[PDB]
Amino acid sequence: ADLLVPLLRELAKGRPVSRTTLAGILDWPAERVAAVLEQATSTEYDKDGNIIGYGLTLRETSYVFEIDDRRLYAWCALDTLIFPALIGRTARVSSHCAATGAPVSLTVSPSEIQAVEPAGMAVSLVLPQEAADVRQSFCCHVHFFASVPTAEDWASKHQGLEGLAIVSVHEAFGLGQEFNRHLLQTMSSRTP
């Protein structure tokens, strides 16, 4: 009697999943499934109203995310992925340096990386702001840099923005892997 979030499990398959199937898969009544979508109106439907799943962007960006046998796209180095460890397979990630334009690519696996090119690429992130208008406020703004010198080089001429910080794709996986514990919390955060 357990549940490892079959929703995304069947989702990763990228196949038409109806409520009777989500229900049939969850071995739960179509009403329980319904209750779930009853609060998910923002979710994208397809055809008669089935769960389309993911998609990120309508294929028109630079950040590419390949997994198993499904080519995905993103608006930032992050949007490409979300939970590699939850997938249970490898995820090929491709990016381009915002300064050198070099073709960067990394392999995101459920345990670590297995294809870093170039061997020394760097990632870029932004600092949290709480004094900006309403629209997005840099929902992501996550880019990659061919390396730390370029990341830091291009970074030098990329100051003034809302913080903006550079990092090693190696440390980016630890900061990205730690977010889980942060999101896992239902509410509040007692520790610091």
Contacts for 38 with CB less than 8 Å, ≥ 6 apart: none
Rounded Cα distance, 18 and 85, in Å: 25
Of the candidates 79, 97, 133, 153, the residue annotated as catalytic is 79
166-175 contact pairs (CB < 8 A, 24+): 166/122, 166/123, 166/124, 166/125, 167/122, 167/123, 167/124, 167/125, 168/122, 168/123, 169/106, 169/113, 169/116, 169/121, 169/122, 169/123, 169/144, 170/113, 172/123, 172/125, 173/108, 173/112, 173/113
Rounded Cα distance, 180 and 176, in Å: 8
- Indicate the pairing of strand 50-51 with strand 63-67: unpaired
Domains of the chain: 5-56 (1.10.10.10), 57-185 (3.15.10.60)
Amino acid at 72: L
Rama region for 23: left / alpha / beta (φ>0; ψ in -120 to 50; rest): alpha
Of the candidates 48, 76, 97, 140, the residue annotated as catalytic is 76
HSE value, Cβ hemisphere, 13 Å, CA-based, for 130: 0
Q: What are phi and psi of 14, to 5 degrees?
A: 60, 50
Kindly report the CA angle at 118 between 116 and 121, in degrees rounded to 5? 80
Catalytic (active site) residue 140: no
Q: 3-state SS of the chain?
A: CCCCCHHHHHHHCCCCECHHHHHHHHCCCHHHHHHHHCCCCCCCEECCCEECCCCCCCCCCCEEEEECCEEEEECCCCCCCCCHHHHCCCEEEEEECCCCCCEEEEEECCCCECCCECCCCEEEECCCCCCCCCCCCCCCCCEEECCHHHHHHHHHCCCCCCCCEEEEHHHHHHHHHHHHHHHHCCCCCCCC
Catalytic (active site) residue 27: no
Catalytic (active site) residue 139: yes
Amino acid at 23: A
Of the candidates 27, 139, 140, 153, the residue annotated as catalytic is 139
Quickly count: other Cβ atoms within 10 Å of residue 176's Cβ: 21
Burial zone of 51 (CB within 10 Å; 0-12 exposed, 13-18 middle, 19+ buried):
buried
